[PDB]
Design a protein around this nucleic acid. Structure first.
Length: 579
DNA sequence: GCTACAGGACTC
DNA sequence: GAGTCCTGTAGC
C-alpha cells in the first residue's frame, strides 16, 4: 500500500543531505549481528536497499560517515554499533526518535518506531513484534514484507521529527536532546564496541573453587536436613525450614513462607542448617549469575564482553547495563569482590582507571534544597553520616558510636528515597513512633531539606511532573490517586527523582566533557563503563599521571553547584586493584 | 516442550 | 529510590 522503489543499486539521489535512515538490526543483541535491510527516505523518495549491495558501495558508505549529510534515526546507537562491527563509520545523525520519545515521557516504555509514533497518533506503521513475531517464533519475513516494513519506519521518522522537536522545545528539552543524549549516544556506542577484556582463566578457576565449596555445602545441608532437596526452590526449602524442622515463621510472601536472607539471619540461632544454607545462597549467586554469567557472554575470539547500555529505559535518567550487566558486579563482600580481577585491560602495559563521585545525591540535595547546614557540611567536606548521626542524636564528633553511624547512614539514604516513617522503622529495626522522631530530629537539623521535600510534592501536584537540573521530566499521574499506598509511592518519586536524575544528568555531561578532553589532550585513554556515579577507563600506564589529574577535574566541573563535587580516583592492574 | 511470574540477591 | 538476572514453578 505504501509507495517505494526497491532498488538494485545506489544512486546519487539516495545521498541527499537530509534523510530518514533505517539500518535494521533484528536481534536484540546487536554486537556482530546481521543487518537485514536498509531504508532511506528523503526529499526525493523512498528507497530500500539490500545490505550487501548498499554496504559494498563506496558512495553509500561515504555518505553514511559524512557528518554534513544529516540523518534522522530511531535508536541510532543500535545502528552505529552494527556498522562498527562491519568496519563502517556512521555519522551526522541529528535526530533520534527513541531518545526524543524517551525524553518526552520515559514512562511510555517506547521500544519501537510504532510506539514512538502513537505519541503523535501516527499509525501508518507496524509494531516490530507484528512483523517479526515474539521471542522464539521470531523470524525476518521474505523481502516484500520486510522492505515495506522499513520504508514505513523511515517515513514515520521523516514525518515525526518536526512534532517531537516542536514539543521538546516547548518543554525546554531540546538542548538536552541535542547537546546531551545524542552526543552521549555516540560515546556509549564507542564504549560498547570497545569491549572489556576478561581473564577467562582467572574465571574458570574461581569457577571451579566454587564448585568444590558448593558440593561441600550441598552435602552438609543434606546431612543436616536428613534429606536431599532442591535448595534453589523457594518452595521445598520452606517445607524443610518451617515444616520438617518446625522453625518460627517470621515472614510470609503471597505464595508461602519467606526465605530471604534478611529472614534467614534471624532464624540463624535455631539450627546449623540455616547459616550453611545462607553461605550457599552467596556461593550460588557467584557461581550461577557470575562465573557462568560471564563465561557465557565472552566472545571467545577476542575474549571481551560487550554489554549494551540501554539509554532510553530507566525512569530517572540512569543508564542500564545488559548482557552482560556490568553495573552490578560484586563489591561489598570480599569473596565476591574477587570477580573484579577478571576484568583486565585490553592491551599489554595498560591499566584500569576508576573515578567516582562521593555523595553525588546529597550534594545535589544540598544544592536543590538549599539547606545551609547540608551545604555547609559539604563546604567543610565532612563525613556526612557522622555529621547526621551527630545531629540527629545531639552528641559531639567523638561521641558517635559505630552503630550510631550506620543508623544515620540509613537516615541519609532514607531521606533521599523520601522514606516513610514506618518504612524506616522496618529498615532500621525500631518502633515507628520514634523512628519518626528521628525524621523530625533530622528535619529541624535541616529545615531547607524539609522545605524541598514539601514543595516538591506540591510542585508535582500543581504540574503533573518533576524535573531534574538538565530539564529531564518524569510524569507522576499517581500523585493525586485516592489510594494511600499508591499516592505515597508517587510522592516518594516526586522527592527521589530530581535527585537520582540530577546525578545521571551530571555524570552524562562529565562523559561528554571527558571524551572531548581525552581527545583534545591527544590521549589513548578510553571510557569502558559508567556505573551510575563512577566512570571506568583503561589507558596505557604512561598516562595514569595525567589522568589522576585530568579525570577528577572534568568529572568535578561538569556543572556548577552551590556546593562542590568531589571525585576520588583509583588505578591498578585490573578493575579489582583500582580500589 | 516454551513462556510468563515470583522470590531472591547483586549493584548504585 | 533506580536497575538486571538467575532457578524453579505454575500453566499453556
Amino acid at each position: 500500500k505504501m509507495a517505494f522503489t526497491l532498488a538494485d543499486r545506489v544512486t546519487e539521489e539516495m545521498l541527499a543531505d537530509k534523510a530518514a535512515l533505517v539500518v535494521e538490526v533484528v536481534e536484540e543483541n546487536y554486537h556482530d549481528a546481521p543487518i537485514v535491510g536498509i531504508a532511506v527516505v528523503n526529499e526525493h523518495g523512498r528507497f530500500f536497499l539490500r545490505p550487501e549491495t548498499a554496504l559494498a558501495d563506496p558512495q553509500f558508505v561515504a555518505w553514511l560517515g559524512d557528518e554534513t549529510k544529516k540523518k534522522s534515526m530511531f535508536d541510532s546507537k543500535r545502528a552505529a554499533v552494527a556498522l562498527k562491527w562491519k568496519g563502517i563509520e556512521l555519522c551526522g545523525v541529528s535526530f533520534d526518535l527513541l531518545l526524543a520519545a524517551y525524553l518526552l515521557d520515559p514512562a511510555q516504555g517506547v521500544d519501537d518506531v510504532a510506539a514512538a509514533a502513537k505519541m503523535k497518533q501516527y499509525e501508518a506503521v507496524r509494531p516490530d513484534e507484528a512483523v517479526y513475531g515474539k521471542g522464539a517464533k521470531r523470524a525476518v519475513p521474505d523481502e516484500p514484507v520486510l522492505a515495506e516494513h522499513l520504508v514505513r519506519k523511515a517515513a514515520a521518522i521523516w514525518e515525526l521529527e518536526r512534532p517531537f522537536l516542536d514539543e521538546l522545545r516547548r518543554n525546554e528539552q531540546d538542548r538536552l536532546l541535542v547537546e546531551l543524549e545524542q552526543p552521549l549516544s555516540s560515546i556509549l556506542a564507542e564504549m560498547e564496541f570497545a569491549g572489556v577484556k576478561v581473564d577467562t582463566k582467572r574465571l574458570e578457576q574461581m569457577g571451579k573453587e566454587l564448585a568444590e565449596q558448593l558440593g561441600t555445602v550441598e552435602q552438609r545441608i543434606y546431612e543436616l536436613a536428613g534429606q536431599e532437596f532442591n535448595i534453589n526452590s523457594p518452595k521445598q526449602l520452606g517445607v524443610i525450614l518451617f515444616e520438617k524442622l518446625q522453625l518460627p515463621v517470621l515472614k510470609k510472601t503471597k505464595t508461602g513462607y519467606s526465605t530471604s536472607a534478611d529472614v534467614l539471619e534471624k532464624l540463624a540461632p535455631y539450627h546449623e542448617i540455616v547459616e550453611n544454607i545462607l553461605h550457599y545462597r552467596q556461593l550460588g549467586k557467584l557461581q550461577s549469575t557470575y562465573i557462568e554469567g560471564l563465561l557465557k557472554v565472552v566472545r571467545p575470539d577476542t575474549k571481551k564482553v560487550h554489554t549494551i547500555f540501554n539509554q532510553a529505559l530507566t525512569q530517572t535518567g540512569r543508564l542500564s547495563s545488559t548482557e552482560p550487566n556490568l553495573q552490578n558486579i560484586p563489591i561489598r563482600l570480599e569473596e565476591g569482590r574477587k570477580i573484579r580481577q577478571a576484568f583486565v585491560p585490553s592491551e599489554s602495559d595498560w591499566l584500569i582507571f576508576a573515578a567516582d563521585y562521593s555523595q553525588i545525591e546529597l550534594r545535589v540535595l544540598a544544592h536543590i534544597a538549599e539547606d545551609d547546614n547540608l551545604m555547609e557540611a559539604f563546604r567543610r567536606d565532612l563525613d556526612i553520616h557522622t555529621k547526621t548521626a551527630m545531629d540527629i542524636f545531639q552528641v559531639s564528633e567523638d561521641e558517635v558510636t559505630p552503630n550510631m553511624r550506620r543508623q544515620a547512614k540509613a537516615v541519609n539514604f532514607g531521606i533521599v528515597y523520601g522514606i516513610s516513617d514506618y518504612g524506616l522503622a522496618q529498615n532500621l529495626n525500631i518502633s515507628r513512633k520514634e523512628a519518626a522522631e528521628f525524621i523530625e530530629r533530622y528535619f529541624e537539623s535541616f529545615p531547607g531539606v524539609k522545605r524541598y521535600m514539601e514543595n516538591i510534592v506540591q510542585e508535582a501536584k500543581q504540574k503533573g511532573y518533576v524535573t531534574t537540573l538538565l530539564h529531564r521530566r518524569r510524569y507522576l499521574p499517581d500523585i493525586t490517586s485516592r489510594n494511600f499506598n499508591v499516592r505515597s509511592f508517587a510522592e516518594r518519586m516526586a522527592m527521589n527523582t530530581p535527585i537520582q536524575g540530577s546525578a545521571a544528568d551530571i555524570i552524562k555531561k562529565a562523559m561528554i566533557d571527558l571524551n572531548a578532553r581525552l581527545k583534545e589532550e591527544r590521549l589513548q585513554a578510553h571510557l569502558l563503563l559508567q556505573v551510575h556515579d563512577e566512570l571506568i577507563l583503561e589507558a596505557p600506564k604512561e598516562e595514569m599521571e595525567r589522568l589522576c589529574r585530568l579525570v577528577p577535574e572534568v568529572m568535578e566541573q561538569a556543572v556548577t553547584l552551590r556546593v562542590p563535587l568531589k571525585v576520588d580516583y583509583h588505578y591498578g592492574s585490573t578493575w579489582y586493584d583500582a580500589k
